[PDB]
Amino acid sequence: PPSILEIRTKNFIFRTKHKLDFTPIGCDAKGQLILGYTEVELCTRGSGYQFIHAADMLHCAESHIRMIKTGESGMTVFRLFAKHSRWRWVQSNARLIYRNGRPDYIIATQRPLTDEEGREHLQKRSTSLPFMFATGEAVL
Amino acid sequence: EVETFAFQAEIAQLMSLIINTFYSNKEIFLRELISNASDALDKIRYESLTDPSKLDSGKELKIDIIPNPQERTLTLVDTGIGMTKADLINNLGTIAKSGTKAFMEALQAGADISMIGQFGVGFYSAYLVAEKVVVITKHNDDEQYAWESSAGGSFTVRADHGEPIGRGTKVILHLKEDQTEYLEERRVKEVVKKHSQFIGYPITLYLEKEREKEIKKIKEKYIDQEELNKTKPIWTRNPDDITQEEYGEFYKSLTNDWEDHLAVKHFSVEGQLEFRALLFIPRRAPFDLFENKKKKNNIKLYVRRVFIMDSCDELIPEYLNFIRGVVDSEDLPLNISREMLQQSKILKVIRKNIVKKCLELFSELAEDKENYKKFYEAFSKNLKLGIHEDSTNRRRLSELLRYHTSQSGDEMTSLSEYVSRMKETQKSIYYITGESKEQVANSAFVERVRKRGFEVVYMTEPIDEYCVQQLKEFDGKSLVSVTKEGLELPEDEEEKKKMEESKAKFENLCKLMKEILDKKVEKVTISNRLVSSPCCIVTSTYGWTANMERIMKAQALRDNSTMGYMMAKKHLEINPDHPIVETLRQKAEADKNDKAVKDLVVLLFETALLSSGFSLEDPQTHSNRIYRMIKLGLGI
Amino acid sequence: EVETFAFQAEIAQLMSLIINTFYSNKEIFLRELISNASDALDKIRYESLTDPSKLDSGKELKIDIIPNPQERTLTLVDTGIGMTKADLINNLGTIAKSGTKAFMEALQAGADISMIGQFGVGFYSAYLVAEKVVVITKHNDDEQYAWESSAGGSFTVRADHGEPIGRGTKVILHLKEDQTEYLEERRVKEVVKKHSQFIGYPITLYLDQEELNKTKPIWTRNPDDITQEEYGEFYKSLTNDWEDHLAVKHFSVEGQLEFRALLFIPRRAPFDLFENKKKKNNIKLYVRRVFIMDSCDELIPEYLNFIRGVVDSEDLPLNISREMLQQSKILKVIRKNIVKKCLELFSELAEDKENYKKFYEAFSKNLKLGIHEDSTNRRRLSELLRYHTSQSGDEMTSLSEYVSRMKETQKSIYYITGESKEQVANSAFVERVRKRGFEVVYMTEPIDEYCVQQLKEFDGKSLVSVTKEGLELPEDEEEKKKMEESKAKFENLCKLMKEILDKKVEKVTISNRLVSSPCCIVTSTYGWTANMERIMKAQALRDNSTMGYMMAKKHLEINPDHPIVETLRQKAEADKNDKAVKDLVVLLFETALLSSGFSLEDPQTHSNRIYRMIKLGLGI
Amino acid sequence: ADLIARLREDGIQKRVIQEGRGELPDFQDGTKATFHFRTLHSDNEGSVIDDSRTRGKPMELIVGKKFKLPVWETIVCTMREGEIAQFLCDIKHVVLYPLVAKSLRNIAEGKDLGHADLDALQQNPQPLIFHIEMLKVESPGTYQQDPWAMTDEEKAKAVPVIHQEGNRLYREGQVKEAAAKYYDAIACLKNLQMKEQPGSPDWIQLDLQITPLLLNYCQCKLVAQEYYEVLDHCSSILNKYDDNVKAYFKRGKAHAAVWNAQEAQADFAKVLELDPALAPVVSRELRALETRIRQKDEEDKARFRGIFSH
Amino acid sequence: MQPASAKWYDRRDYVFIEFCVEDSKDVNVNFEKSKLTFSCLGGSDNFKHLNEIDLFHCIDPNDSKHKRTDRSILCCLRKGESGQSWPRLTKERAKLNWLSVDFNNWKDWED
Amino acid sequence: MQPASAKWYDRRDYVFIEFCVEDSKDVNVNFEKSKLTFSCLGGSDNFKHLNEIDLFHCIDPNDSKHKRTDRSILCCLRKGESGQSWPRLTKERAKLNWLSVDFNNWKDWEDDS
Numbered sequence A: 001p002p003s004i005l006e007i008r009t010k011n012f013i014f015r016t017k018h019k020l021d022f023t024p025i026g027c028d029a030k031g032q033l034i035l036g037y038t039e040v041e042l043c044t045r046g047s048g049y050q051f052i053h054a055a056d057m058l059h060c061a062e063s064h065i066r067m068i069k070t071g072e073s074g075m076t077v078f079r080l081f082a083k084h085s086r087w088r089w090v091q092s093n094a095r096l097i098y099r100n101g102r103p104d105y106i107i108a109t110q111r112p113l114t115d116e117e118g119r120e121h122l123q124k125r126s127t128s129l130p131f132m133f134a135t136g137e138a139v140l
Numbered sequence B: 001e002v003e004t005f006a007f008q009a010e011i012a013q014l015m016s017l018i019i020n021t022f023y024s025n026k027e028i029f030l031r032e033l034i035s036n037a038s039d040a041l042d043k044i045r046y047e048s049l050t051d052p053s054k055l056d057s058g059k060e061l062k063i064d065i066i067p068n069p070q071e072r073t074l075t076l077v078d079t080g081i082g083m084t085k086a087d088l089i090n091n092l093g094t095i096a097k098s099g100t101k102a103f104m105e106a107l108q109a110g111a112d113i114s115m116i117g118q119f120g121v122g123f124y125s126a127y128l129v130a131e132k133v134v135v136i137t138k139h140n141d142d143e144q145y146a147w148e149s150s151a152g153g154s155f156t157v158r159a160d161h162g163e164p165i166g167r168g169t170k171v172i173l174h175l176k177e178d179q180t181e182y183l184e185e186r187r188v189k190e191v192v193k194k195h196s197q198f199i200g201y202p203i204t205l206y207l208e209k210e211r212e213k214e215i216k217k218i219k220e221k222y223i224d225q226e227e228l229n230k231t232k233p234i235w236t237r238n239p240d241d242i243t244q245e246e247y248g249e250f251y252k253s254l255t256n257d258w259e260d261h262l263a264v265k266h267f268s269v270e271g272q273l274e275f276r277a278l279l280f281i282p283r284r285a286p287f288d289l290f291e292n293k294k295k296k297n298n299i300k301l302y303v304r305r306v307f308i309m310d311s312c313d314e315l316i317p318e319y320l321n322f323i324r325g326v327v328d329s330e331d332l333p334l335n336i337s338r339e340m341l342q343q344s345k346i347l348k349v350i351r352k353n354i355v356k357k358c359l360e361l362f363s364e365l366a367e368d369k370e371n372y373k374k375f376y377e378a379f380s381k382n383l384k385l386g387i388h389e390d391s392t393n394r395r396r397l398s399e400l401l402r403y404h405t406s407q408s409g410d411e412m413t414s415l416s417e418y419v420s421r422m423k424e425t426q427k428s429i430y431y432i433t434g435e436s437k438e439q440v441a442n443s444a445f446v447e448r449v450r451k452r453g454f455e456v457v458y459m460t461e462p463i464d465e466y467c468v469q470q471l472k473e474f475d476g477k478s479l480v481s482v483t484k485e486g487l488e489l490p491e492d493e494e495e496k497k498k499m500e501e502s503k504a505k506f507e508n509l510c511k512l513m514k515e516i517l518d519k520k521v522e523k524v525t526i527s528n529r530l531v532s533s534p535c536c537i538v539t540s541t542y543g544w545t546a547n548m549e550r551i552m553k554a555q556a557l558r559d560n561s562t563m564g565y566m567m568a569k570k571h572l573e574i575n576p577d578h579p580i581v582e583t584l585r586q587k588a589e590a591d592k593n594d595k596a597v598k599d600l601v602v603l604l605f606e607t608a609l610l611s612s613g614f615s616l617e618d619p620q621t622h623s624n625r626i627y628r629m630i631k632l633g634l635g636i
Numbered sequence C: 001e002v003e004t005f006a007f008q009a010e011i012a013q014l015m016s017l018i019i020n021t022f023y024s025n026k027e028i029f030l031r032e033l034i035s036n037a038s039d040a041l042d043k044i045r046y047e048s049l050t051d052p053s054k055l056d057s058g059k060e061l062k063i064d065i066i067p068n069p070q071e072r073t074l075t076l077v078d079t080g081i082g083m084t085k086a087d088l089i090n091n092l093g094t095i096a097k098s099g100t101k102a103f104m105e106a107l108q109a110g111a112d113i114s115m116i117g118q119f120g121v122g123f124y125s126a127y128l129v130a131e132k133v134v135v136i137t138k139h140n141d142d143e144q145y146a147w148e149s150s151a152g153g154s155f156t157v158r159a160d161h162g163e164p165i166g167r168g169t170k171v172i173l174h175l176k177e178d179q180t181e182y183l184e185e186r187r188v189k190e191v192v193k194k195h196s197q198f199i200g201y202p203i204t205l206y207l208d209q210e211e212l213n214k215t216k217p218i219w220t221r222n223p224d225d226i227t228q229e230e231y232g233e234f235y236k237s238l239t240n241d242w243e244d245h246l247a248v249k250h251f252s253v254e255g256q257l258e259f260r261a262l263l264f265i266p267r268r269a270p271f272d273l274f275e276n277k278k279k280k281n282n283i284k285l286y287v288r289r290v291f292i293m294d295s296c297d298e299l300i301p302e303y304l305n306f307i308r309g310v311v312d313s314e315d316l317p318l319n320i321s322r323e324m325l326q327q328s329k330i331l332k333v334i335r336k337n338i339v340k341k342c343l344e345l346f347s348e349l350a351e352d353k354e355n356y357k358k359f360y361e362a363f364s365k366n367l368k369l370g371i372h373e374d375s376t377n378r379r380r381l382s383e384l385l386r387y388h389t390s391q392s393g394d395e396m397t398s399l400s401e402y403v404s405r406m407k408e409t410q411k412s413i414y415y416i417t418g419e420s421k422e423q424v425a426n427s428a429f430v431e432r433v434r435k436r437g438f439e440v441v442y443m444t445e446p447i448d449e450y451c452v453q454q455l456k457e458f459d460g461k462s463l464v465s466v467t468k469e470g471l472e473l474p475e476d477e478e479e480k481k482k483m484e485e486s487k488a489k490f491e492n493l494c495k496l497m498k499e500i501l502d503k504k505v506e507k508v509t510i511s512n513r514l515v516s517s518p519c520c521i522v523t524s525t526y527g528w529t530a531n532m533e534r535i536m537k538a539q540a541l542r543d544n545s546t547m548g549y550m551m552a553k554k555h556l557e558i559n560p561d562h563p564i565v566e567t568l569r570q571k572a573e574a575d576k577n578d579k580a581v582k583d584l585v586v587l588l589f590e591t592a593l594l595s596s597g598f599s600l601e602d603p604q605t606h607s608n609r610i611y612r613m614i615k616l617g618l619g620i
Numbered sequence D: 001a002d003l004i005a006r007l008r009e010d011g012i013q014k015r016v017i018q019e020g021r022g023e024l025p026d027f028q029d030g031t032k033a034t035f036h037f038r039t040l041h042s043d044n045e046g047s048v049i050d051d052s053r054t055r056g057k058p059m060e061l062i063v064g065k066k067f068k069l070p071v072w073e074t075i076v077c078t079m080r081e082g083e084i085a086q087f088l089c090d091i092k093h094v095v096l097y098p099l100v101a102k103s104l105r106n107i108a109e110g111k112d113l114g115h116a117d118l119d120a121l122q123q124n125p126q127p128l129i130f131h132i133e134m135l136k137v138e139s140p141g142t143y144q145q146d147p148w149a150m151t152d153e154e155k156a157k158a159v160p161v162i163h164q165e166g167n168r169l170y171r172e173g174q175v176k177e178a179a180a181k182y183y184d185a186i187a188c189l190k191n192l193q194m195k196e197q198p199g200s201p202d203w204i205q206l207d208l209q210i211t212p213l214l215l216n217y218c219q220c221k222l223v224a225q226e227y228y229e230v231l232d233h234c235s236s237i238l239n240k241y242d243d244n245v246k247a248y249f250k251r252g253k254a255h256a257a258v259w260n261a262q263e264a265q266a267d268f269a270k271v272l273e274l275d276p277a278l279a280p281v282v283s284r285e286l287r288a289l290e291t292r293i294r295q296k297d298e299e300d301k302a303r304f305r306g307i308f309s310h
Numbered sequence E: 001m002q003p004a005s006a007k008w009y010d011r012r013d014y015v016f017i018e019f020c021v022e023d024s025k026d027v028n029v030n031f032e033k034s035k036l037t038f039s040c041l042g043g044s045d046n047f048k049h050l051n052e053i054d055l056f057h058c059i060d061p062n063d064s065k066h067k068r069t070d071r072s073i074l075c076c077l078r079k080g081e082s083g084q085s086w087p088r089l090t091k092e093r094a095k096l097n098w099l100s101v102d103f104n105n106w107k108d109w110e111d
Numbered sequence F: 001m002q003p004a005s006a007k008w009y010d011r012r013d014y015v016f017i018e019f020c021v022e023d024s025k026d027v028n029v030n031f032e033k034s035k036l037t038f039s040c041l042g043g044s045d046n047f048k049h050l051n052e053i054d055l056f057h058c059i060d061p062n063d064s065k066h067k068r069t070d071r072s073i074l075c076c077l078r079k080g081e082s083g084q085s086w087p088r089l090t091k092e093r094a095k096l097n098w099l100s101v102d103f104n105n106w107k108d109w110e111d112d113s
């Protein structure tokens, strides 16, 4: 009977609590350091605005529709804020919590990316949209 | 003649031993002081039960800690029994004597109180952080005194005339200049929460902030009534008097989880080793579950509501590492530091009971099929690992398994239901393993077994190859795999003549195949398991399963030398019903030396090798064969 | 008014503390008495250096043990310095009075004495196993005396008339009724070997005399005066192997944390390595030649588990039971120094360009596991790896030599990962690289992928795989337009087959590394390669939920020179939708996906397509 | 006098040369500006490095608030169709020159190199003389006004015009234009959709009115033979509207077009069990698929007899 | 007049109780079917000590015996029927606060 | 006359020496550029105590200070250069039997985290 002798890995998965409007109300331990932005400041204040960059907050909606029909938002990529004005990419799924009969809150599983990952995932991002002509490119 | 002496003690070096050798962490002085104050509170409460005249000077019971950042003093204030002059002299000025132990020896039997400490060396841990110490004390039998010392051989006891205390004790600690970190509040909160969270009395602290107050900005620095013991223990309550939300609240406090638990087990044991435990199964399996070799800290251990240790490895087996809870007791043999449990053979006895009660929790949860699926989809790998690890409780641990089968749709199904759904003639149970369900469903191996109307289990995870080296039987049933040599379907008595006839017909062709595929196979025999495909390849009876070879060729740290020892022993079988075999024998009989026959048999072997659970050597030649095929297909 | 009292302590509770809560093992009484006897011998030697007459009553400095099962009294004797009556009252009959510590502080200079006992408790451990303890002693300045107690508050001191001991001490232990296990010479020998092996004076055992601590410590001796045979004998007596040690390192560190370390590399790796998981005792820590603790994973990292040896010190803090260091920080320094010296032992062993192979063949897996784990020593372990290449033939060669063989325009180290050398040496991936005369690396072991995950660079040169995308080979201008024009005359077919697949390949381009094959499959720049994913999906403890977070895309590439793709392009031009085009493109994809190492899901699809082709071609 | 005063109060020095002809088209938000230009260096002997006739396509412009640098928007209002003069741009009005310069050179006609002049001029952002060749200014609302011109209320009512016009062209037999305009309607409805919170009721309402347009656009591709476009659009649609009928018929037809018989039959079963008693055409399709498969197999692919003739 | 401290444990056939008295004078210990009485006078302070405990199950007054050293008094009690596990020592389930199990030589003998 | 038992350790800037003399009377300490002297009447039996040390490097006598507590005399010394590492306290290499390292305050200030 051969044993199990595989070397364990150092994966960096971390979770956060999002409310029904996707806004957070807290983060767990590994998030306290990977993001570095301690519990209390995101729990009470959270800057008032979204922790998702605007160029990616439109891509949260497509995840949400799956999340509300079945429960899982699928594999999506955002851009969190960090304390040093940083930008830490994430690969993320979401699960919503049912109270009696009805939703209660949202907890999500996220994996960080080094910024090269984000650049390569973004260079393709800005072209894969079935919109109209950008002739005379004024604004997005 | 003989002369008799009494054992003595050198006080200076005994002090040095206490302050230098006993205690490794310097943050346990607060644990000891808090425990002392709690014991003093227990005494006054127990004496006030009989006649409340004793409780006429101060009704509340509380512990107060006052940092004094300017004056570098940490102060405890306690509203307990206090000590008189003689008590001060005999108790705090004599090492190894404790009045708590004498009290527990003195009271009438059957009293409902449990006070901490019987060593009598706990107080002197304060010098690990303090230069000199002041103990101002008030008791109901005499006036208010002040006990002064600096651990240097002597101490001074004086009458005090400050402001009244009413009743209780006040330990003032003048901190040494290198430990001035036990004044900021992060550290005191951390220490109190980690060590003395579940003391049975309120613990109060003073946070000197400034609030934005208005009725032109005024800075009003003030003293906050703060406290640090919001959560009570619940394992000290009747297991029936608790609702299912009190448990959830306590679990959320204990593990800092976000959702409530999935199942809570509350139990107590009686005997020489007595303890009461709560065990929580979390709904969602924790990420970073099988990586942390050091800080798993799943199960904590308490003694009389005082933290002892968290990361023992004989407390629980490593296949139950997701179970989180607390274990508390009354009479464990602590060591002089109250951080390690003497003679750790007790941990085996604790572990046995924890294991058996967790198995009982799994079985009880198995009745509510509405929520057992969520437990399986999070800890199936844990249960299979458990099957692979221990042998004593193998049976019931295997009984909890769920699998997909031949006709189960999208619903996992157990083994007992499979035995219920079994044909009356079935001698054995059929299983198959692979990377995905879709791969093993359309496997050529099981096509005839499925058509004849049999029901076959699907294992899909790599841990299943370890799970099937020990599942020899389930309810006295022989588990056999369709990918081996001797797949034994129920012998009908009508097809036996056909089988032997075709055996005679194709012995020649099997021998012809055996001599062209030299050392690529071990023998070419006749099949009884293919109905819709030409020849397939299977594995021997005492060798690694074709999928076990794939898994064993992935252990990074494994030794390579013994690879040819357990190496597979492949077998090629014959479909006598596909037109390939018919034309193959027809060409063979008229010519034993053709090129087309050799090329086609090599191609069939090398294309059925992929269909099984095997990996081609030198795949470029297979690709080149198909390349010459495509080229001739386009005519070049 | 003020009142000062003498700060006190009572004896009954203190003795109960010592007996009941200090020591968890009943076997360490022997460790305590043996240490006391060794100190008593050191005293009588030191007083004899500057006054030869002190040994006029006895000349040999030895220790005996006299187990006696006829009447359960274990006896321990020695020929040390002894005690006087005043010494008996003031040294034994006081809880925290250490005679040894008072002897130490009264040494006239920096003499050659290093004694063990300092706490003054520890002699009382004799009551862990004995009901009554007697001590018959004689000191050179007075008469032989007896001492008796039961640890019940009172002890007696009598003048003696028995058989004279001559000089020294005799501590006698009337063993408890339920502890008659320490009279068995198995138990005594096991305890002595574990705890008091390397003591500085001979220890015998009267059953018929026989000596226990035969082997002497060599880490104390100046390591410029040891011959390899002595090291070999010590290694054999330490590890029980009947082979010699391959290498040895014997250094020392001076300062606040002073210690001598002596390290060994066994000749052959143990067969139960990585698997035992029960005991990891390979570096034993000693303090003044008395065992303290085995390696509880703080002394040495896991990837150096094969190292064996000792660590000895003269000043380290110990808890009351003398079974554990008082500070975890000490172990960090010890670990740092021991790792730093091990990585120099390896480099010195690598200079012998022949004996190094017999070490690599044994512990390359451990070095690679270290490269995975140890993030601070990667730049030093990367120079201890040897790999097959496309030019070394049957020899394993370095990476520094690879840099010393790199062409004038070569800029990076090319590597491939597979499962057998004869297969990786002919794959479609390396055909063009072998054409331009470059050298690739055949890392063909499962741990190689883990190593490459972390390495990412070496000597200013960066590892680049041929199984990844966008491989850039230094190449001239003439091809620079051939490749561009080929991409310009293959847009149609590339897009058409990409959309025929449309779900299982992310993108389709023109290849850059094929000569004889028409197509192959490469993974994305990041995420798992083919082999890494093949290995990860077979772990049995892989977290199934987080596969997608570590997956990678696919890429199909086309060799424009191959006749089959040229004809296929010719066909697809005349008709954008021929069924032959779709069928044959799907067949090419399946064949290339099997060639590139991937596991092909639904293999019966491929098998049945081949089967049907055989059907029709054969004429059925 | 305010025109003349404001012209010369803002770093601009212009002399009236000749006035134009006709009424003023609206310069409001959404106004179109199609014109050429010529650029002259102020002091470098007027070296014409930038010029529209050297590239061959006239660059457009966005007059309203959508586009940036209101200096261009102001200067366009100064001239009119056929009216051309010299301009002289102030230093403060050329401060962010290279940022836009590189963007417009990249967005020139469009491919789907290196330029030292551009990065050198990036080092020195300097004003130039743009002798802009004005062609004409159009008026919003007075023609087939551009989809991005208005503020979603004109589109909200305009889209039915496009839908009806596309239907009329389709039934006449014009297919490419119908597909184009259905795409344009889908695009305007989509960037409408991307303004309001998902999970809102009007979100689902919008999706409901846009779905038939998406099916209509998917229709023409079947005549256009890009069956994979049909697959991509239908499979996207049906993840959430599980109960449509034509959203099944079209992708079934597409599947059956490219020899995907298995999924073709699988889809046809569902479309029948949502729309019973409508067999005839489905039978035609299924048996045409089977006969074409058999025909190809019997003649064209039986060529393989030689694969083992040796 | 006051009960003395005690530690205890058990084995396959024996129940061992140890009374933590020092310098005991003229101890008396009596054995019957279900009761054990222990009487001493310890220390120079001359404080009397008496312990009367009913037993959890019957023991053997013949095979049972006691030993006075100094540090304590040892009592050996052979069970009335061997193998019988004792979860406690007395009959009543209330916690006699002067008694505790001795874990320095405890043993889980029923493995 | 014998030297008093002493313990020592160091930080980045300061070297600490604690002379374990209980109930010290008439404590007198002397500081110099590379010299240290200590004397007291220790305990109640009135034995004398004198410790003489040749400092391993230069200290600042104006900045160093000694504060006596009831249990022991603690001295705090400033180094001549902020950051230099002291493997030992004396100039000579011979081990002294009245000096040992305070492992309950020792720390690696060189490799901070």
Ligand SMILES: Nc1ncnc2c1ncn2[C@@H]1O[C@H](COP(=O)(O)OP(=O)(O)O)[C@@H](O)[C@H]1O
Pocket (backbone or CB within 6 Å): B036, B037, B040, B078, B080, B081, B082, B083, B091, B092, B097, B098, B099, B100, B101, B116, B117, B118, B119, B120, B121, B122, B123, B124, B169
């Ligand atoms: N804060 C306090 N208030 C009142 N009495 C106390 C307090 N602290 C200690 N005592 C008494 O003084 C004695 C000091 O002993 P201690 O060092 O606490 O050892 P232990 O913790 O084993 O009791 C105790 O027996 C207790 O009865």
Ligand SMILES: Nc1ncnc2c1ncn2[C@@H]1O[C@H](COP(=O)(O)OP(=O)(O)O)[C@@H](O)[C@H]1O
Pocket (backbone or CB within 6 Å): C035, C036, C037, C040, C078, C080, C081, C082, C083, C091, C092, C097, C098, C099, C100, C101, C116, C117, C118, C119, C120, C121, C122, C123, C124, C168, C169, C170
């Ligand atoms: N065999 C012996 N000969 C001489 N002295 C002894 C012997 N055994 C013990 N001692 C004395 O025991 C005294 C201290 O008791 P112990 O607990 O052994 O101290 P330590 O911690 O120093 O070992 C020391 O005086 C030492 O001299």
Ligand code: BEF
Pocket (backbone or CB within 6 Å): B032, B033, B035, B036, B039, B100, B116, B117, B118, B119, B120, B121, B122, B123
């Ligand atoms: F807090 Be004491 F040690 F019981």
Ligand code: BEF
Pocket (backbone or CB within 6 Å): C032, C033, C035, C036, C037, C116, C117, C118, C119, C120, C121, C122, C123
């Ligand atoms: F042998 Be002693 F306890 F140092």
